[PDB]
Amino acid sequence: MASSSGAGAAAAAAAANLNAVRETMDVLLEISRILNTGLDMETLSICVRLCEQGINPEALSSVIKELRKATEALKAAENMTS
C-alpha cells in the first residue's frame, strides 16, 4: 500500500524543481531585459539552448549581428509588401 504514496512525492519533488527552474528563467528574462539584449522568449530560449551547448559568446554575438542585418532587410521587405 505504501508504494502508491511514494509516486506522488516523487512527482511533487520534480514539480518543485520545475517551478524553481521557471522562477529562475523569469529572473533570467528580467536580467536580459535590463541588459537590453533584444531577445524574445522564443529567441532567448533558443540562445540559452545554444549557450548551454557551449557557443562562444563572441562568435554568438557576431552571428547574431549578421542574422540581425539579414532579418532587418527581410523585415523591411515584409513590411513594405503588406
Partner: peptide, 10 residues
C-alpha cells in the same frame, strides 16, 4: 516554451 527552456530535464 518552458520545455524548450528547461532543456528536456523537466
Amino acid at each position: 516554451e518552458l520545455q524548450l527552456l528547461a532543456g528536456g530535464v523537466l
